[PDB]
Design a protein around this ligand. Sequence first.
Ligand SMILES: *Cc1cc2c(cc1C)nc1c(=O)[nH]c(=O)nc-1n2C[C@H](O)[C@H](O)[C@H](O)COP(=O)(O)OP(=O)(O)OC[C@H]1O[C@@H](n2cnc3c(N)ncnc32)[C@H](O)[C@@H]1O
Ligand SMILES: *Cc1cc2c(cc1C)nc1c(=O)[nH]c(=O)nc-1n2C[C@H](O)[C@H](O)[C@H](O)COP(=O)(O)OP(=O)(O)OC[C@H]1O[C@@H](n2cnc3c(N)ncnc32)[C@H](O)[C@@H]1O
Ligand code: HEM
Ligand code: HEM
Ligand code: HEM
Ligand code: HEM
Ligand SMILES: CCCCCCCCCCCCO[C@@H]1O[C@H](CO)[C@@H](O[C@H]2O[C@H](CO)[C@@H](O)[C@H](O)[C@H]2O)[C@H](O)[C@H]1O
Ligand SMILES: CCCCCCCCCCCCO[C@@H]1O[C@H](CO)[C@@H](O[C@H]2O[C@H](CO)[C@@H](O)[C@H](O)[C@H]2O)[C@H](O)[C@H]1O
Ligand SMILES: O=C(O)/C=C/C(=O)O
Ligand code: SF4
Ligand code: F3S
Ligand code: FES
Ligand code: NA
Lengths: 655, 55, 239, 254, 254
Amino acid sequence: MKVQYCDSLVIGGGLAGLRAAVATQQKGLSTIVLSLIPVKRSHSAAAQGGMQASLGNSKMSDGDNEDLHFMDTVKGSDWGCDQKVARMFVNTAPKAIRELAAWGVPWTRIHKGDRMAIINAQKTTITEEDFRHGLIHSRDFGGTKKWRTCYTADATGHTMLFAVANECLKLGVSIQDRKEAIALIHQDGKCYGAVVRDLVTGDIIAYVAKGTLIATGGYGRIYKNTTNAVVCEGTGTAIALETGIAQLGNMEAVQFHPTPLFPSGILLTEGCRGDGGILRDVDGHRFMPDYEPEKKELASRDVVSRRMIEHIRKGKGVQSPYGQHLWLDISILGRKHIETNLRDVQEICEYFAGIDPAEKWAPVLPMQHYSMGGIRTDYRGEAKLKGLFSAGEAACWDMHGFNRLGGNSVSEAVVAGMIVGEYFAEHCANTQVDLETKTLEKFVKGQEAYMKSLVESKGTEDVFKIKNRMKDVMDDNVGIFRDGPHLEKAVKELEELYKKSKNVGIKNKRLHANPELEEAYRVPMMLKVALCVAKGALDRTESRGAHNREDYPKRDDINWLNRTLASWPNPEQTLPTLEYEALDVNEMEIAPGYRGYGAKGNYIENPLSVKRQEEIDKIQSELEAAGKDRHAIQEALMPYELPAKYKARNERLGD
Amino acid sequence: MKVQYCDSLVIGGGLAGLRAAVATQQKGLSTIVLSLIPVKRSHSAAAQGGMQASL
Amino acid sequence: MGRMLTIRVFKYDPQSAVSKPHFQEYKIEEAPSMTIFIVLNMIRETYDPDLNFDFVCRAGICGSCGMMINGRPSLACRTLTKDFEDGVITLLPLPAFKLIKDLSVDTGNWFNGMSQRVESWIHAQKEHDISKLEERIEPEVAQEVFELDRCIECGCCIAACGTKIMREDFVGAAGLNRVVRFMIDPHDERTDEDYYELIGDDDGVFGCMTLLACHDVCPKNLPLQSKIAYLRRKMVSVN
Amino acid sequence: MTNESILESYSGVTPERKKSRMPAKLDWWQSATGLFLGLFMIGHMFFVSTILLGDNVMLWVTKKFELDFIFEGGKPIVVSFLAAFVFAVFIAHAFLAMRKFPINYRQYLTFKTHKDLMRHGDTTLWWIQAMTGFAMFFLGSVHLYIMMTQPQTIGPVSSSFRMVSEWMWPLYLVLLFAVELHGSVGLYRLAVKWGWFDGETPDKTRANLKKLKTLMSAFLIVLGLLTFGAYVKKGLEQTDPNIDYKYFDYKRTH
Amino acid sequence: MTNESILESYSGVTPERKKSRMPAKLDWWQSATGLFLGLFMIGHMFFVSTILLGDNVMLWVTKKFELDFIFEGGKPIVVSFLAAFVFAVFIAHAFLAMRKFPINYRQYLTFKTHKDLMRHGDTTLWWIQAMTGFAMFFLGSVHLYIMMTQPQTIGPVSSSFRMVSEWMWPLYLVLLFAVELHGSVGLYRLAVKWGWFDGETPDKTRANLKKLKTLMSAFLIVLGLLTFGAYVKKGLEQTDPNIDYKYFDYKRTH
Ligand SMILES: *Cc1cc2c(cc1C)nc1c(=O)[nH]c(=O)nc-1n2C[C@H](O)[C@H](O)[C@H](O)COP(=O)(O)OP(=O)(O)OC[C@H]1O[C@@H](n2cnc3c(N)ncnc32)[C@H](O)[C@@H]1O
Ligand SMILES: *Cc1cc2c(cc1C)nc1c(=O)[nH]c(=O)nc-1n2C[C@H](O)[C@H](O)[C@H](O)COP(=O)(O)OP(=O)(O)OC[C@H]1O[C@@H](n2cnc3c(N)ncnc32)[C@H](O)[C@@H]1O
Ligand code: HEM
Ligand code: HEM
Ligand code: HEM
Ligand code: HEM
Ligand SMILES: CCCCCCCCCCCCO[C@@H]1O[C@H](CO)[C@@H](O[C@H]2O[C@H](CO)[C@@H](O)[C@H](O)[C@H]2O)[C@H](O)[C@H]1O
Ligand SMILES: CCCCCCCCCCCCO[C@@H]1O[C@H](CO)[C@@H](O[C@H]2O[C@H](CO)[C@@H](O)[C@H](O)[C@H]2O)[C@H](O)[C@H]1O
Ligand SMILES: O=C(O)/C=C/C(=O)O
Ligand code: SF4
Ligand code: F3S
Ligand code: FES
Ligand code: NA
C-alpha cells in the first residue's frame, strides 16, 4: 500500500487552498497541496473584475470602512449569510490586499489629478488629491456605492494566484498536481485524509494528515452553460458529501452572470455595461429601459439577468443553432474607448467570437457563474466531520447567503485562506490522530476495486451522453427562473440519470492516464451534487437572492429564514437528505429588511425581525449618545471571533 | 513532522537485510531498506572463505 | 455544409509497452467560430475517448492548452480552424517538456522548477505591517511590473526555443522574463549581483542565442526581445 | 592548473563562493570579435570593389594601405600584419562561436526538425549562420593565409591573375555568399541581442533592422558579383605567356 | 523533414519504438574517415619525400600519379580529383570528430584541470588530438585547396618555389607536427578503441602499440624535417628573375 503523510493536507490549488497552505507551512507544519492541474491554472486565474476591500484610498472610496462593506454584503445576501462570518471577512479583506501588495501583486495605483470617469448619475470628472497618489486604486464594480474593488489592470485573479503560488514555492510547500482526491478517509466522525488517484499513473494512494482542508472551487460545470473552467465539476463537494457525515449548504444557491459570450461562456466583464454598454434584442431594440425605466442597463446584475430571460420568453430573442440569445453593443462607446479601457474584451470577441466589438455586436446570454453553496462549516471553517475544513468557493462559510457581491469571492478565497488557515493550523498542531492501517487499507482497497469495476463494466450506457443530458436538465430547469412542476421533473430525471451512470461502459481499459475512466467516476459524483442543487431548489418554496421561484415570488422570512443542509447518510439512497439550520435573528447585527434591488415589500416580514430592529435602534441610540465609537457599538450588537493574528484594526488614509 | 510509511521496514543493507527485502517486495509489500552506507559496501562483502551448504 | 477538416494528431503512450509513436487522422466538419478546443472535445466524446490533452479555462488565460499547431506552439483554445486555408491541421504536443501522453505534457512541474530556480518571489528583509497603509508605488512602475507579470506559464516560448530543445538546462525565455519582472519591482531588494548568481551562466542568460521565436509566439505578447537584451547588458556588466 | 582553478572545477564556484564571471567575458568577446569581422568585411567589400573604378584607382588605394605616405613605394608587409591580425580575430571568433553549434545527433535532429516545422525566419537564419560559419573554416583560411603571405601580389592585374589562372574564383564565389549572409545576419542579431537601438518601440526597431539587413545583403551581394566579374574578365584577358602577371603590379614601384 | 524524423524527434525513438541506429553509423564513419586520412598521410609523406632521392625521382612519381601510362605527359587534373576527394573526407571527418570537443566553459575548465591533475598519458594525448584537429581547420584547408587547384605546379622545382617564394614553409612546418601528432595518436587510439589486435594479452598489445606509435611519429617527423629542408634549400637557390619556376616542372612535357 502507498501512503503519504503530512501534518496538513490541502485539496485544491486555487487562491483559498494555496493561501491556507501558506498559513500552515509557515508555522512548521508539513503541508501538501493536491491539485488536478498545475495550481497557477486554477479558475481563480480568470478573475478580471477585481477584489473587494474597504481601503478607502481613492476619491470614490473616501469614507469607506468595514461597516459599509459589511452592510453591502449582508443586504446583498438577502439575509441568508452568517453575519458574524461576514464581519470576520470585511475586517480582514483590507489586510489581505496589503499582504498581497507586500508579496508583489502589482495593484493599479492612484495618480494625482483629474480623471475621465463614468458615474452614470453625473459622469463628470474625478479628482485624486496628492496625498492619495501611489496608494492602491479601486473601481466601480459589484454595484456598491463606495468604489472598493481593487485590481491589477485586467488580470487580477491571475496576479493574485501567481503571488500566492510563488509564496508556497518559497516556503517549500509540497505541490503535487495531476492528483485527484476521489474519497475522504474517515472513522468515528473524524477525517484522517483522502484517497487519491494519480491521474498520470493511475496509482491509488492514501494521503493521511492530522487535518484536511477542501478548497476545490465551485460546481458550475453541472450546468451546460457556465463561465467556469472545465475542471469546476464539484468533485470536492461530492467527496465530502459521500462521507455521509459532512453536510452541504445552500446548494440551490447558484449565481448567474448576465453577459457571458454565447455560447462559449467566455466572460465579458461587467465593465461593458458599467461603461455604457447596451443590450439589444433580435430587432436591435434597446430593451432594458422598457423594464427598468430608471436604472436601465445599469440595474442590479440580478435584475438584468432576469429581464434578459423575460425578454427572450416574450419571443424577442435571437435564434441560433446553439439556442436563443441577445446582443451586447459596446461599439457605441467608441473605438478609441474600447482600445484603451476595454482592450481585453476586444481581444476576447475577436479571438473567440471572431468579431470586433467596436463594429459588431456580441452574442450574450446569462449563464451559471458562482457557487454560493458548498461544504457547510462553522466560523472556523470546520465541517461536521471533525478535522475536515473547507474554504473558498467550495465552502458555505456563508458570508454570501443567497447572493454574493461581485468582487467578494476572490476576496473571500484569500481571506478564508488566511482565517480558516490559522484555525486549520491550530487544529493540525494541537490534535492527535489515531491512524489505523485497517481503515486506510479499507478505503484504498475500496477505490482500487471501484476503478477495476469501472474498467470491467459490461454496461452499455455512454458516460458523455449521460453527462451532457445532466447539463441540459440543469440549464433548462434549475436556472434563473424556477417552478415546482419543472423542478419535480428535473429531480426525477436526474435520479434516473444517476442510476444509469452505474451502467456505464468504457472503451479504454488502461488504469493510467485515462480520460474516459476519469469521466466514469466523476459523472456519478456530479449527479449527486446536481441532485442536492435541484432537490434543494424544489423544496425551498420562496424566492431569495439568486433563487427565484415563479410559483413562490416572495422572500419568506417566516418559514425560510434558514440554510439548506444536504447530506447522503445512506449510500443506498438515491436522493439527498435535506435538513434546515435556522438563522437566529437575535444574533444579527442587521435585522432582515429590504435588500435594495428588486420590488419592494416582496418579502413576508417576520415578527422577530421587528423586535430585533427596535432592539438595535435602541442600543445604537444609547451608545451613540454616550459618545461611543462605531467599534464599541458593533461589539454590543454582535460580537464575532477572529484569530489573534488578525484582530488588529485597519489603518486608513484619514485617521 | 517528517513521516515515511512502508509496509515492511528493513534496517540494514547486508545479505540478511537485502534478502529479507526481496522476500517482502516480491509479494507486493512496499518495503524500504535503510543503511548507514551504500548497501553493496556492507561488511558481508568482505567474506572470502565461502558459504556452507550440503550440496 | 462547413467543409471537412482533416485533423492529424500525434499519439503515443510512453507508459504502455505496446504503444508506438504515430499520427491518427480524424474527419471533422467545421462549424462557425470553431476552435481546436471544440474540435478536440468533439473527437473525445464522439470518435476517440483515448486521446489525451489538457484544457482548463478555454479562454486563453490559464496557459494549459499549448501545443504545436501546424508547426507553431499556440494556445489551442484560442486557435480557430477558419484560419487554416487548406483544412488540414496537424497537432503535436509541445516539445521540450516531458511527454505524458499524446498531446499532454508536463509544463506545470517544469515551471515550478524554474520558479524555484530563479527564486520567483519578493525578497525583502522586513515584512510590511498588513494593518497599516501599503507602501506607495508610482503608477507607471506598477504598470511596468504588471506587463511582465502577465506571463501565464503556457510554455509556448519554451517549446518554440531551438536552444532549449537542444540544451535542456537552458532556463528559457520565461525564466529570463521572470528575473526581469522582479528586477524592476521596487519591493524586491535583490541587486544585479544577486541575479547573476541565479542566471549568470551558460544555462542562463548567456545561453540565449537570440532566435527570438519566443517573442514571436508569446500569446500574451510580452516584450521578450527587449527585456532579455536588457538583462544581457546588465549581467555582462557585473563585477 | 592553479589552486583556484581546481577549487572552481571541484566546487562549481570561485573561492569566494560566487559563480564564475568567465561565461560573461566569453559572451562579450564572442560578440566583440563578431562585430569586428562584420564591420571589417563591409569596408573590405568597398576597397576590393575599387577595381570597378579602374586599375589606377584600386592601385592607388592598395598603395595607401601599404603606407605610401610613409614609405617609398609602400611596403606590402603592412598588409601582412593586417592579415595576420584579422586571421587571429577570425580564429578567436570561430573558437568562441563554435560553442553554439548543435553538437550531437540528438541536437542536430531535433533542431533541424524544429526549424522545418516552425518556418520561423529568425530561427532559420541562425541555421544559416551556423552553416556558413562551418563552411568558412575551410573557405576563409585559404584566402587569409594567401593575403598574409603574398601581399605583393595584390592589384588590378595580379589579383585578376590569382582569380583566374590560379583558380581562386570558385572559392571566392562561394565565400562571397557565405560571408555576406553570415555577416549581415550576424550584425542584425547582434543588434537585437544587445538591444542597443531598442528605444521606446522595440518591435518597430526590429522591423526596420530586418529590412536594413536584407538591403545591406542585397547591395553587397550584387556589388560583390559585379566586382567578381571585373576580376574574372581581366584575368581572362591575360593570355601573353611572356608576361609575369602575378608580380606585375609589384614590378612598378618596388 | 519527414513523418519518421518528426516521430523520432518528439518520441525519442523510431516508429518501431527502438533507439536510432544513427549514433552507431556516425561512430563508424568518424573512425572510417579517420583511418583513411591517417593511412593517406603515411603514403603522402613517402611520395613527398622522394625529393630526397633527386629531382628526377619525384618528378617520375609525380607523373605516375597523373596517369603517365595512360596519357601523354600525364594530366595533372588527376591530382585535382584526388585532392577534391581527400578534401571531402577531410571535411566529413572534421564534421564528425568536432562532436567530441569540449564545447563550453565548464567542460573546457574541468577537462583541462583534470588533464593537469591526472598527468595521464593517453588522456593528455587526446587533448593534443583535439588541439591539433582544431588547428588543421585553418592549416589543412589552405594546402588542400592549392593542391586541388594548382596541380600543374607540383614538382622538384615548382614545389620548392611555393615553399619559399610564396612563403608556404611556415604553414608546412606547423602542419607537419600538427598532422603527424594527430595522425599517429589517432591510429593508436583507433586500435585500442576497436581492439582489432587485443588477442589474449590485451595489456601487452597496448604496450606495443604505444611504442609503435612513438616510433612512427619520430621517424615521420624527422623524415618530414629532412624533406622540408630539401624543398627549402632548393627554393632558396632559385634566384634568377627571368625563370618561371612556378610552372617550370610543367613546362617539360605539357
Ligand atoms: C469563473 C469566474 C469566476 C470569477 C471571475 C471570472 C470568472 C470567469 N471574476 C471574479 C472577479 O472579478 N471577482 C471575484 O470576486 N470573483 C470572481 N470570480 C469567482 C472567483 O474567481 C472564484 O470564486 C475564486 O477564484 C474561487 O477560488 P478557489 O480557491 O476557491 O477555487 P479555484 O480557484 O477554482 O480552485 C479550485 C482548485 O481545486 C482543485 N480541485 C478541484 N477538485 C479537485 C479534486 N477532486 N482533487 C484535487 N484537486 C481538486 C483544482 O484543480 C483547483 O486547483
Ligand atoms: C568481518 C568478516 C566477516 C566474515 C568473513 C570475513 C570478514 C573480514 N568471512 C566469512 C566467510 O568466509 N564465511 C562466512 O560464513 N562468514 C564470514 N564472515 C562473517 C559474515 O560475512 C557476516 O556474519 C555476514 O556477512 C553478516 O551479514 P549481515 O547481513 O548480517 O550484516 P552486514 O553485512 O554487516 O550488514 C549490516 C548492515 O547494517 C547497516 N546498519 C548497521 N547499523 C545501522 C543503523 N543503526 N542504521 C541503519 N543501518 C545500519 C549497515 O550499513 C549494513 O548495511
Ligand atoms: C569574416 C568571417 C566572419 C564574420 C564576418 C563573422 C561575423 C559574425 C557575427 C556578426 C556574429 C554575431 C556574434 C554574436 O551574436 O555575438 C557571428 C555569429 C556566429 N558566427 Fe561568425 N563570423 C565570421 C566567421 C565565422 C567562422 C569561421 C565561424 C566558425 C565556427 C563562425 C561561426 C559563428 C556562429 C556559429 C555564430 C553564432 C553564435 C551564436 O549564436 O551565439 N563565424 N559571426
Ligand atoms: C586583412 C585581410 C584581407 C585582405 C587584405 C583581403 C584582400 C582581398 C583582395 C585583394 C581581394 C581581391 C582578389 C585577390 O587579390 O585575390 C579579396 C577578395 C575577396 N575577399 Fe578578401 N581580404 C581579407 C580578408 C577577407 C576575409 C576575412 C574574408 C572572408 C572570410 C574575405 C573575403 C573575400 C571575398 C569573398 C573576396 C571576393 C570579392 C568579390 O569577388 O566580390 N576577405 N580580398
Ligand atoms: C589529414 C588530417 C587528419 C588526420 C590524419 C586525422 C586522423 C584522425 C584519426 C586517425 C582519428 C581517430 C578517429 C577515431 O578515433 O574514430 C582522429 C580523431 C580526431 N580528429 Fe582527426 N584527422 C585529421 C584532421 C582533423 C580535423 C581537421 C579535425 C577537426 C575537427 C579533426 C578532429 C579530430 C578529433 C577531435 C578527434 C577525436 C575524436 C574522438 O575522440 O572520438 N581531425 N583523427
Ligand atoms: C591529395 C592531396 C594532397 C596532395 C596531392 C598533396 C601534395 C603535396 C605536395 C606536392 C607537397 C610538397 C610541397 C608543395 O608542392 O607545396 C606537400 C607537402 C605537405 N603536405 Fe600535402 N598533399 C595532399 C594532402 C595533404 C593533407 C591532407 C595534409 C595534411 C592536412 C598534408 C600535409 C602536408 C605537409 C605537412 C607537407 C609538408 C611536407 C614536409 O615538409 O615534410 N597534405 N603535399
Ligand atoms: C550545417 C553545419 C553543421 C554544424 C556542425 C555541428 C552540427 C553538426 C555536427 C554534429 C551533429 C552530427 O550530425 C549528424 O550528421 C549526419 C550527416 O552525416 C546527419 O545525417 C542525416 O543528414 C545528412 C545530411 O542532410 C543526410 O545525408 C543523412 O542521410 C541523414 O541521416 C545526422 O542527422 C546528424 O545528426
Ligand atoms: C585547444 C582547442 C580547443 C578545442 C575547441 C573547443 C573547446 C574550446 C572552446 C569551447 C570552450 C570555450 O573555451 C574558453 O576559452 C577561453 C579562451 O578565450 C578560456 O580562457 C582561459 O584560457 C585561455 C587560454 O589558456 C587564457 O588566455 C584565459 O586567460 C583563461 O581565462 C576558457 O577557460 C575556455 O573555457
Ligand atoms: O464581470 C466580471 O468581470 C466579473 C463578474 C463577477 O465576478 O460577478
Ligand atoms: S513568456 Fe509568453 S509564451 Fe512564455 S510562458 Fe509566459 S506567456 Fe507563455
Ligand atoms: S527563442 Fe530561445 S534563444 Fe533566446 S531569444 Fe527566445 S529564449
Ligand atoms: S485552456 Fe486555458 S489557455 Fe487554453
Ligand atoms: Na460556495
